[PDB]
From a paper:
In the SAP05-SPL5 binary complex, the ZnF of SPL5 possesses two zinc-binding subdomains, of which N-terminal subdomain contains an extended loop followed by two short helices to coordinate one Cys3His-type zinc finger motif, whereas the C-terminal subdomain employs a three-stranded antiparallel β-sheet and a short helix to coordinate a Cys2HisCys-type zinc finger motif. It should be noted that, unlike other types of zinc-binding domains, these two zinc-binding sequence motifs are not interleaved, thereby forming a unique plant-specific TF called SQUAMOSA promoter binding protein (SBP). In the SAP05-SPL5 structure, both subdomains of SPL5 participate in the interactions with SAP05. Particularly, for the N-terminal subdomain’s contacts, a hydrophobic core is formed at the interface between the α1 of the N-terminal subdomain donated by Tyr78 and Tyr79 and the β3 of SAP05 donated by Ile84 and Trp85. Besides, the Lys90 from α2 of the N-terminal subdomain forms a bidentate salt bridge with the carboxyl group of Glu107 from SAP05. Likewise, for the C-terminal subdomain’s contacts, a bidentate salt bridge is created by the Arg121 and the Asp106. This interface is further strengthened by three direct hydrogen bonds contributed by Gln105 and Ser108 of the C-terminal subdomain with Arg104 and Asn77 of SAP05. For example, in the SAP05-SPL5 interface, substitution of SAP05 Glu107 or Asp106 with alanine, which would disrupt the salt-bridged interaction, resulted in 15-fold decreased or abolished binding affinity for SPL5. Moreover, the alanine substitution of SAP05 Trp85, impairing hydrophobic interaction, caused a complete loss of SPL5 binding. In parallel, alanine replacement of the corresponding electrostatic or hydrophobic interacting Arg121, Tyr78 or Tyr79 in SPL5 abrogated its ability to bind SAP05.
SAP05 is an effector from a plant pathogenic phytoplasma that mediates the degradation of host transcription factors, including SPL and GATA family proteins, by hijacking the 26 S plant ubiquitin receptor RPN10 independently of substrate ubiquitination. Specifically, SAP05 folds into a tight globular structure consisting of a parallel five-stranded β-sheet (β1-β5). Although SAP05 carries a single domain, it utilizes two opposing surfaces (hereafter referred to as Lobe1 and Lobe2) to interact simultaneously with TFs and AtRPN10, forming a dumbbell-shaped structure, in which TFs and AtRPN10 have no direct surface contacts. In summary, SAP05 bridges the TFs mainly through electrostatic interactions with a hydrophobic core, whereas the SAP05-AtRPN10 interface comprises predominantly extensive hydrophobic contacts.
Numbering used by the authors:
A (entry chain B): 36 to 135
B (entry chain A): 59 to 124
C (entry chain D): 37 to 133
């Protein structure tokens, strides 16, 4: 939830998904044509395409900053993904703010 | 062809696929296949490089090159 | 994350510019000031008082109700957490990395 070995978990909060479009350099890893939060199996542009299973309703996406991992839709929850850095030093988790 | 999966026997059109696949000229199935014939030789799509290498560039049961 | 009845809410942002499209926190910041500030009361642009010896990447503190001492370079983040004075939420704004 904060660190898994050598991987830092970074929760970043945004007003909405459109505000991420201004966030360099990470915006180029999103696929903004897609609905529902995605994670990346590798480092390429538009690589965050894999549907996170049963996501929190305000989760916007997950970006692992290095290495590779299994790449499938509706198979891995956010908690499972925190175990799948596979060498990534940072796992960035993008959240939409909600007021309590 | 420009708009198609680059696997020799594959004709899947990628103009409607996710940009990641259209960028790298590979359909989803062949991106995950253990091997496909590409440019006349056995290759596997490297997860790390987003491109095919010949099989000896991969260690055992690996989807990225060493 | 709790001091009695006060919830302490840590929010981490991409950059200070990301806060400017955040209702309701944008109007309580004073973006003409540099260095993280806290508010002594509820009013537009009330986050003006300099937090003392602020940690790296702290962007500001907003208490969502009531009043407290209002002064520069006097209250650390740690002491501010005792200074809600009835505030139901203390928002602590951070810069990532
Ligand atoms: Zn194909
Ligand atoms: Zn490779």
């Amino acid at each position: 939830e904060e660190r898994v070995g050598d991987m830092r978990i970074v929760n970043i909060t945004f007003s909405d998904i459109n505000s991420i479009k201004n966030f360099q350099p990470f915006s180029q890893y999103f696929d903004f044509t897609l609905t529902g939060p995605r994670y990346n199996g590798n480092i390429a542009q538009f690589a965050m395409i894999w549907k996170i299973k049963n996501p929190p309703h305000n989760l916007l996406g997950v970006f692992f900053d290095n290495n590779t991992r299994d790449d499938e839709d509706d198979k891995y929850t956010l908690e499972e993904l925190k175990q799948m850095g596979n060498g990534a030093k940072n796992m960035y988790i993008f959240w939409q703010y909600e007021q309590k | 062809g420009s708009r198609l999966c680059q696997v020799d026997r594959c004709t899947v059109n990628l103009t409607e696929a996710k940009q990641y696949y259209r960028r790298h000229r590979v359909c989803e199935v062949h991106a995950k296949a253990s091997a496909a014939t590409v440019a006349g030789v056995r290759q596997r799509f490297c997860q790390q490089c987003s491109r095919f290498h010949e099989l000896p560039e991969f260690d055992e049961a690996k989807r990225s090159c060493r």
